[PDB]
Design an enzyme around this catalytic site. Structure first.
Site, PDB file in Angstrom:
ATOM      1  N   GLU A 168       0.827  -1.201   0.000  1.00 27.57           N
ATOM      2  CA  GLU A 168       0.000   0.000   0.000  1.00 27.57           C
ATOM      3  C   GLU A 168       0.865   1.257   0.000  1.00 27.57           C
ATOM      4  O   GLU A 168       0.548   2.243  -0.666  1.00 27.57           O
ATOM      5  CB  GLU A 168      -0.929   0.007   1.216  1.00 27.57           C
TER       6      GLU A 168
ATOM      7  N   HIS B   2      -8.745 -15.782 -12.327  1.00 28.31           N
ATOM      8  CA  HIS B   2      -7.854 -15.104 -11.400  1.00 28.31           C
ATOM      9  C   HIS B   2      -6.914 -16.122 -10.753  1.00 28.31           C
ATOM     10  O   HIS B   2      -7.244 -17.293 -10.574  1.00 28.31           O
ATOM     11  CB  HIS B   2      -8.651 -14.296 -10.374  1.00 28.31           C
TER      12      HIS B   2
ATOM     13  N   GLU C  50      -6.379 -17.118  -8.122  1.00 28.54           N
ATOM     14  CA  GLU C  50      -7.082 -18.020  -7.217  1.00 28.54           C
ATOM     15  C   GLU C  50      -7.702 -19.185  -7.984  1.00 28.54           C
ATOM     16  O   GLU C  50      -7.486 -20.348  -7.646  1.00 28.54           O
ATOM     17  CB  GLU C  50      -8.168 -17.265  -6.449  1.00 28.54           C
TER      18      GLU C  50
ATOM     19  N   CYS D  99     -11.544 -11.610  -4.883  1.00 31.91           N
ATOM     20  CA  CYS D  99     -12.737 -10.829  -5.188  1.00 31.91           C
ATOM     21  C   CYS D  99     -13.999 -11.659  -4.975  1.00 31.91           C
ATOM     22  O   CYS D  99     -13.935 -12.879  -4.828  1.00 31.91           O
ATOM     23  CB  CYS D  99     -12.685 -10.320  -6.630  1.00 31.91           C
TER      24      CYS D  99
ATOM     25  N   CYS E 144     -13.590 -14.560  -7.004  1.00 32.94           N
ATOM     26  CA  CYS E 144     -12.513 -15.488  -6.678  1.00 32.94           C
ATOM     27  C   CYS E 144     -12.927 -16.426  -5.549  1.00 32.94           C
ATOM     28  O   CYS E 144     -12.692 -17.633  -5.613  1.00 32.94           O
ATOM     29  CB  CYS E 144     -11.252 -14.718  -6.281  1.00 32.94           C
TER      30      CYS E 144
HETATM   31 ZN   LIG Z   1     -10.026 -12.171  -7.967  1.00 33.99          ZN
END
Ligand SMILES: [Zn+2]
Length: 192
Positions: free
Chosen positions: A22, A60, A62, A90, A93
């Site tokens: 971040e 993704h 994942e 997400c 995901c």
């Molecule tokens: Zn995702």
């Protein structure tokens, strides 16, 4: 999958790759580590490892897992899956992931995230819950887990040997993200 030679990443690179924090502007692509450990009433066990690459438009990182990594599982063995990442899956995901736990019991899926992402969307909340309601295991990627993923999922220089020691904050950061992951699991009543 996209396997090739080794199932880990070279520190020389991971240093500038996993740096995606971040407090850092500029990201390329994050890798998701997966560790599956199967067993048969004690005896023969199959252990797998490797990183996945998120598809710009498709599956993704994942998903890529159950896409090639864990395509199928036997209800007679105890599969122990483990995911070590920094970004949370997400609402999509965590979907294809929950649909696997709601069917596989002997299979123990685990996922950790040093930082919660999109944990403020009304869609991710209902998409992340199923995981906790299906049997999935969610935990704030502790600063102690990295070490392993740093010495195993990451190749260290030759002759040398370091150790990811977060002198910034081990708990302060954990407790922070801890309330985030849980939050989704705990929602207050609408009385406004
Ligand atoms: Zn995702």
């Amino acid at each position: 999958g996209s396997s090739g030679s080794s199932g880990r990443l070279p520190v020389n690179f991971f240093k500038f790759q996993f740096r995606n924090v971040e407090y850092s502007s500029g990201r390329n692509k994050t890798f998701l580590c997966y560790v599956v450990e199967v067993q048969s009433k004690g005896g023969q066990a199959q252990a797998t490892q490797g990183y996945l690459e998120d598809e710009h438009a498709g599956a993704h990182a994942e998903e890529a897992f159950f896409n090639t990594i864990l395509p199928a599982f036997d209800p007679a063995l105890k599969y122990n899956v483990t995911w070590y990442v920094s970004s949370s899956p997400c609402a999509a995901c965590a979907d294809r992931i929950l649909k696997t736990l709601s069917k596989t019991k002997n299979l123990r899926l685990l996922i950790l995230v040093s930082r919660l992402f999109m944990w403020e969307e009304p869609e991710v909340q209902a998409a992340l819950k199923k995981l906790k309601e299906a049997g999935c295991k969610l935990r704030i990627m502790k600063p102690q887990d990295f070490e392993y993923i740093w010495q195993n999922f990451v190749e260290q220089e030759e002759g040398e040997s370091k150790a990811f020691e977060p002198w910034e904050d081990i708990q302060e950061n954990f407790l922070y993200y801890e309330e985030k992951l849980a939050d989704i699991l705990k929602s207050g009543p609408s009385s406004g």
